[PDB]
Structure formats: C-alpha cells, structure tokens
Ligand SMILES: NC(=O)c1ccc[n+]([C@@H]2O[C@H](COP(=O)([O-])OP(=O)(O)OC[C@H]3O[C@@H](n4cnc5c(N)ncnc54)[C@H](OP(=O)(O)O)[C@@H]3O)[C@@H](O)[C@H]2O)c1
C-alpha cells in the first residue's frame with residue numbers, strides 16, 4: 001500500500017525556499033522510524049534539499065530529467081516510481097508538495113506531524129478531504145529542551 005509521511009506547520013506549510021525552517025529532533029526520529037527498511041519516493045526538489053541518500057531505504061527520485069547519481073533510483077513517472085518499488089507492503093512517499101499532490105489519491109495512510117509553528121513558506125501540503133480519513137493514532141507532545149515547539153504525531157487511514 002502507499003502512504004504519505006510529512007511534517008506540517010501552521011496553515012499546512014511544508015517548506016520554504018527548499019528547506020524546512022524548524023528543527024525538531026523528535027520528528028526526525030519518528031520519520032526515520034516509520035520509513036526505515038521501506039522504499040521512499042521523493043521529488044527532485046526534495047532530493048536536493050536532503051542532499052544525500054537516506055540509508056537503509058531504497059531511495060527513488062521522480063524527475064523528468066535523466067539521473068545524475070547512481071546511488072539512487074531515478075524514474076520519470078508515478079507508475080514507474082511505484083513499479084520500481086517492487087512487491088513490498090508499504091511504500092513511503094516523502095514529498096515534496098507536487099509529489100504529495102499526485103500520490104494522495106492513491107494513498108491509503110497518512111503519517112502527519114502537526115507542528116505548532118508559524119512559518120511563512122512557499123510549499124504546502126495538499127488540502128485533503130477530512131471526511132475520508134480516519135485518525136487511528138494521535139500523540140501530543142509539549143515543547144522541550146531539544147524541541148522548540150509542541151507537535152502532534154498522527155496516523156490517518158482512508159475510510
Ligand atoms: N515538511 C515535510 O514533511 C516535507 C517533505 C518533503 C519536502 N518538503 C519540502 O518541499 C519543498 C520541495 O517540494 P516541491 O514541491 O518544491 O518539489 P518536489 O515535489 O520535491 O519536487 C518536484 C519535482 O519532482 C519531479 N516530479 C514530480 N512529479 C513528477 C512526475 N509525475 N514525473 C516526473 N517528474 C516528476 C519534477 O522534477 P524535474 O524538474 O527534474 O522534472 C518536479 O520538478 C522544500 O521546501 C522541501 O523542503 C517538506
């Protein structure tokens with residue numbers, strides 16, 4: 001099945017100038033935990049902000065342009081990206097904006113982190129139809145010494 005994983009601040013903001021303004025060590029631990037040993041699909045911009053292959057996962061990048069690093073897999077369309085994953089139980093789509101928009105309809109599960117932070121950005125998470133989704137897991141956390149804002153980890157399943 002296909003799942004989307006993402007961190008959103010106020011207003012569904014997900015990035016600004018090809019980067020994520022905040023720093024939340026706990027959220028990144030959660031991201032790694034949920035994606036390790038699974039294939040991750042990302043768009044070219046995202047590949048670029050990340051700057052290197054994510055270890056322990058098959059990294060698949062979507063680009064209309066030919067590949068430029070053999071350490072990852074390059075695909076030119078959504079169907080090929082999905083076929084490149086092979087037979088696995090869960091495929092993780094990691095963004096960015098344009099790529100989330102294209103996979104949303106095909107996704108059965110969303111792993112969202114809501115962050116209490118007001119950031120002015122240029123990329124947003126798609127505006128999905130709440131009706132259609134069921135929250136099956138929620139876990140709130142106040143801010144602390146290592147994490148600058150409070151956040152909520154949530155998992156939705158398409159009804
Ligand atoms: N907070 C989060 O959880 C989170 C997660 C991911 C990203 N982000 C952020 O989001 C921004 C990057 O998002 P973005 O929307 O600018 O770009 P993106 O979605 O990472 O990348 C867009 C690109 O990927 C390729 N692509 C997408 N769909 C394709 C398709 N169907 N066939 C072929 N190529 C396709 C195209 O590359 P070519 O131009 O080479 O065709 C397109 O320009 C950043 O600020 C990043 O920091 C945030």
Ligand SMILES: Nc1nc(=O)c2nc(CNc3ccc(C(=O)N[C@@H](CCC(=O)O)C(=O)O)cc3)cnc2[nH]1
Pocket residue numbers: 005006007020027028029030031032046049050054055094095112113
């Ligand atoms: N919940 C969530 N938070 C994010 O920050 C996020 N970021 C992306 C894309 N950007 C990035 C940027 C850096 C790393 C990264 O450095 N990850 C390391 C974690 C380090 C640790 O495990 O403590 C990794 O191995 O996953 C991942 C995605 C996609 N979905 C997200 N989803």
Ligand SMILES: [Mn+2]
Pocket residue numbers: 158159
């Ligand atoms: Mn159902």
